[PDB]
Amino acid sequence: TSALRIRCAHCDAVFDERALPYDADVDSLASSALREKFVRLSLDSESVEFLNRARARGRDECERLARKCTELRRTMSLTEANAILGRGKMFVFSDAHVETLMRACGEGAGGGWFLDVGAGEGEVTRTLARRFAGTCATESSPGMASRLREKGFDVVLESDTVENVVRETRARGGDVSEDGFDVVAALNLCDRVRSPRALLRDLKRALKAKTGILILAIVVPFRPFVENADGTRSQPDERLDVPSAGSWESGVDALWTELIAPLGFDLVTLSRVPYISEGDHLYDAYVLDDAVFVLRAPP
């Protein structure tokens, strides 16, 4: 009539979909702008549908892909091996999450140019790119860059920098405005890049003045570490005053100041969504705590 109550000491931690945190303590933020500009998102059938992808795939099938992935990544990275096998997909935003934040930033209706930094597979930003008449993407992987040119992206820049992204897009047929893109998404990239300040500065000069929407996602807690190449682990140079542990509210207020706020952005809305990763034969999904900052470019 109910689940089994088995007392163990080595079964790890397991939660359901209702335990996923979507809200936070609003009054526990020293920054005033972070309190009123908070929009609480929630679960939906699209996010739950992503959770059951490992269950509907089969345990024996999730084991075949896992063994083949470790065998493939001897000569490539982890993300490149998952794209070849069609596993390890990432989920952050649902279609309902899109219509909520797009109406909040003013540019709710479709149209304009969109830039996805670090897309690779673009499945995370797939529902978002349906609104813009022009879509661009930047990915340093050659194999994954060719995949983006087949899914609907008009221009796919095969590089890991965004110094002259607004100018290099126009060189490849990207009929984007000379003053920058309209909306740019940098989802879960500050924990991997070396210079997070120089990244936001490059993201700033890539947007239009005044009317310039920026979508930034950072995993909380913020543990920055840069991977050089194969078997070469490094450390970030910019020591941001952000705790490596603690609660979600402390990391947001620490990432707001010191890093995001000194850039001079206008906070449109702040939300808390789970960073869902596709499961396998052991767990249905792996989830991290993610924070979403929607910013407007200064004049």
Author numbering: 7 to 305
Paper quotes:
The human (Homo sapiens; Hs) methyltransferase (MTase) METTL9 is the first enzyme shown to generate 1-methylhistidine (π-methylhistidine) in proteins. Putative METTL9 orthologues are found in most eukaryotes, and we have here investigated the activity of such enzymes from several species, representing all five eukaryotic supergroups.
To investigate whether any structural differences could explain the distinct substrate specificity of OtMETTL9, we solved its apo crystal structure and compared it to the recently published structures of HsMETTL9 (16, 17). Among them, the region containing β′2-β′3 has a slightly different orientation in OtMETTL9 than in HsMETTL9 as will be discussed later. Most of the residues that are in contact with the X or XN positions in the HsMETTL9 structures are identical and have a similar orientation in the OtMETTL9 structure, such as N88 (Hs N118), R93 (Hs R123), G94 (Hs G124), M96 (Hs M126), R198 (Hs R214), D286 (Hs D300), and Y292 (Hs Y306), whereas S283 has similar properties to the human C297.
